[PDB]
Subunit: 314 residues, 3 copies
């Protein structure tokens, strides 16, 4: 099976600059070369060139609506393509607004897909509920079918067609949710496991419950939108929106090791990795290194070990 | 329902100076202002003025017996007062000796109360078993009915009347217990969950078991005596008696989110927060921040989120 | 019952120098004096003097085969002795190659023994599967009966006689296994709990399953070969082969607390503690301190507390 990797030097989804360097940061650390040592076939696509929309005035509160919408449209297009050729799309981020295009492109080829969102945030603010006009904290609002027409049409998101319903998404890691966001996820009855749920059940039982919720009836393609700020900052400090008391480096991997076992992984997102936000070159190393580990785990690497089939090591 | 904050800038309960600054450290960080943003009514009572008893000679081993006893008597008086007006008392500490007055005052209005003690210590040394004459490590001995008359009358603790029995208290966090204490908690058959028990059962099951032990038969008021040294030092380093391998920031909150859910919280203690004991202004920030978080969690703030009733955010 | 500490200041099992200082580092911190405060009888045997084999040419890839083999032979001899006198052997390491002599000597007196290996590695590379000729990463290959004759005779292991079978050993902590090693442990059907398994089940349930596997039928002597690198580096940083996402200081202790409870502990290994590899004197303090704690836990010290029998503390 195919692994094609995307690259998405974007940063307008939020205020802090540096996230667009992420892709480079992940490749710098040899992400691709390591991925080729796996049982998979790896073809690096390269980094997309995002055309900057001039005079990108704010839409009410929202910032960079046109620039963001145009980048995602461009991403959804590439992702949809590769996915059409039956390959697995690994989108190396910037900010988490690129989820929009990353998932939108995926649902074109596999509309029955499901989404496992590992972030410390729900990122489900409608342009009417954000306190800041930042788009990396709204990806899901533009994707939810139940949220269609609950807010005005944002410039450049005309092409966006709500592709997933409340029933096809599950959050993991939640620890920072606004009043607005919480409302929505309580009203729409979305399935989540906030840190409190991970404490009570154990990452082990949480994976059991999410796999029987999203996969209990029909087996469908799995789209993992992972941000780095889903783990405690003590593991992923080089991020723009760290929140204390997050998933451990161990739970992080466990989540990815259990997803590889389903053989249903179809789309992946390694988002929000910001190099310039590390307080020491070390913190950067740390973050990147665990971002690479999470990835590789998604494609086979187990903590127990790996040996090549048919090779008698004795 | 009412919330009445009570400063108690005391420090004679132990050797290290700095704990009396705790109240100011917690207010400095905006504890009260944050508490008012909750569904509760907040009235700050202010910091008590503790009269220093001159020529406070030691009683055998015990130090500052008269000074300590007089402060607590003064505290038990205020707490009893506010509790008489049906309000929830939040005692912002110094040292943990103030538990004496904090609880003694509470039992005057609600004698059937129960106590959940989250510390890494049992603090149950009778003036005959301490190796150091420090009173913050004996609070419980003066409160336990079964320990009445097992040690000599300490100067200034004449007014103290044992209010709770071995059956109405539960420890969580234990990790440093002396030979004497352990003897006692084993003899009196007190219910506890030392770190080993939290490892074996999971904070989730521990709360289940403590709530069915103290609340299984009769629903009674809950008085939470929380210290900061109940969490691992990597979370609450600005304390005088840190002990490694403690409760995580996550378990800490879980304990408090489960207590809010009982709607039975009646008295609270945020003790032992020492600002001058931080090795970097950061460690102080850290400690205080998590001390504020624990508090807020006791009164509603959930990690999943919060939205105001009756407000249609759409 | 008897305790006899055995220094083994060895380091040829690997490249990085400093591990031979371990013994001294553990004694420096008062390991022995602390052990005598327990209900056990402690007799320090002293540190063994390892004779250095001249012109110790490599055997193919393997390095220092003769020097290593001669030290272990000398160790297996002392351990077998004290075990003959019905005492518990606590081997203070260097590198983990000394496991060979530590266990080999133990099986002479108690052949039906079992082994609980807590490391982040399987240390089961046959001189044909190592990528580096390092022996601390092969101890188990020389001990396994099923691995007899699967590799050439290494100079100085003539004396080694495979004493335990695949069925008598259980790993805990695994997180870094090569292709070769993983093969073997999958082929020989060895029982293990890699970090993934500890995440899924909980250290509590893991102990339950290792004790019913290796002990469910016949009760036999327990040989605990512990390595420091089995815990996350944030606890045991002063080691030569740290690997992230390991057992916590809490799980580490739980493992040792449950083993004391079996009253079946017969042999113990506190290996790989390297003083010179600490980035700050603190990191060294840290590591050593937790290495001492694990030890003491193996012989009684509980996190809940300890009181002397027959002493009425009141
Ligand atoms: Mn996000
Ligand atoms: Mn205390
Ligand atoms: Mn080892």
């Amino acid at each position: 099976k195919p692994i094609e990797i995307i690259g998405a030097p974007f940063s307008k989804g939020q205020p802090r600059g540096g996230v667009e360097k992420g892709p480079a940061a992940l490749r710098k650390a040899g992400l691709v070369e390591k991925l080729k040592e796996t049982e998979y076939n790896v073809r690096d696509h390269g980094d997309l060139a995002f055309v900057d929309v001039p005079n990108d005035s704010p839409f009410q509160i929202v910032k960079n609506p046109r620039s963001v919408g145009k980048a995602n449209e461009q991403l959804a297009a590439v992702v949809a393509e590769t996915q059409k050729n039956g390959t697995i799309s690994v989108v190396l981020g910037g900010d988490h607004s690129m989820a929009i295009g990353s998932i939108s492109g995926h649902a074109r080829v596999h509309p029955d897909l499901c989404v496992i969102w590992v972030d410390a945030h729900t990122d489900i603010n409608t342009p009417l509920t954000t306190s800041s006009g930042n788009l990396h904290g709204q990806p899901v609002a533009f994707l939810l079918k139940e949220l269609k027409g609950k807010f005005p049409d944002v410039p450049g998101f005309s092409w966006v067609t709500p592709c997933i319903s409340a029933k096809d998404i599950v959050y993991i890691g939640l620890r920072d949710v606004d009043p607005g966001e919480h409302y929505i996820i309580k009203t729409l009855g979305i399935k989540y496991f906030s840190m409190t749920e991970v404490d009570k059940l154990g990452i082990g039982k949480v994976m059991e419950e999410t796999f029987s919720y999203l996969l209990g009836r029909k087996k469908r393609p799995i789209h993992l939108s992972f941000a780095v700020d889903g783990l405690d900052p003590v593991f992923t400090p080089a991020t723009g929106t760290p929140v204390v008391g997050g998933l451990s480096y161990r739970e992080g991997l466990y989540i990815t090791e259990e997803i590889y076992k389903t053989g249903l992984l179809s789309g992946l997102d390694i988002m929000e990795v910001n190099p310039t936000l590390g307080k020491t070159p070390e913190e950067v190393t740390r973050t990147v290194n665990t971002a690479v580990a999470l990835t590789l785990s998604c494609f086979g690497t187990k903590r127990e070990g790996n040996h090549k089939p048919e090779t008698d090591y004795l």
